[PDB]
């Protein structure tokens with residue numbers, strides 16, 4: 001459980017993200033695919049774009065980054081009271097996309113990386129610690145939902 005002050009640091013930097021959701025989403029997904037190429041296998045071969053410039057030019061990738069960050073932002077704004085937002089996400093990611101918790105740790109690391117790269121003055125140690133706690137809680141609760149659906153994460 002996060003304190004109210006930790007939630008405030010999470011949501012303070014998230015408002016910075018919302019100034020350019022598409023740009024952040026592009027940076028986060030490109031960082032994920034570069035840091036962990038295997039994650040690009042969960043998306044079908046139709047992509048597997050070969051260069052960074054192709055990734056940045058991809059309207060499909062940009063639109064998807066917005067979809068991802070919008071869902072995460074909706075969850076974060078619930079400050080832990082997120083069962084109703086999290087359940088459909090767990091359903092699709094356990095039973096259709098088959099995304100292990102390990103991959104959620106990878107994308108959390110990418111989120112942290114891009115937030116620090118773009119917003120260092122609003123993402124010092126206490127804000128990094130609060131975002132880390134928020135994403136840990138997200139991953140814990142989604143793992144529990146995964147198991148409830150029969151997916152061992």
Ligand code: HEM
Nearest residue numbers: 039042043067068069071072089092093097099103104107
């Ligand atoms: C913060 C973490 C994440 C959030 C909030 C998120 C959310 C979503 C949302 C809202 C969609 C569209 C609706 C749906 O099917 O549920 C989606 C699609 C998808 N997501 Fe995730 N997701 C993340 C974790 C991941 C990771 C780590 C991978 C791959 C390693 C992944 C790849 C999947 C795939 C494969 C689709 C279908 C894409 C397509 O339309 O072809 N996601 N995601």
Ligand SMILES: COc1ccccc1O
Nearest residue numbers: 029043047058060061064
């Ligand atoms: C769903 O579309 C994409 C997601 C991630 C990377 C490239 C894409 O076209």
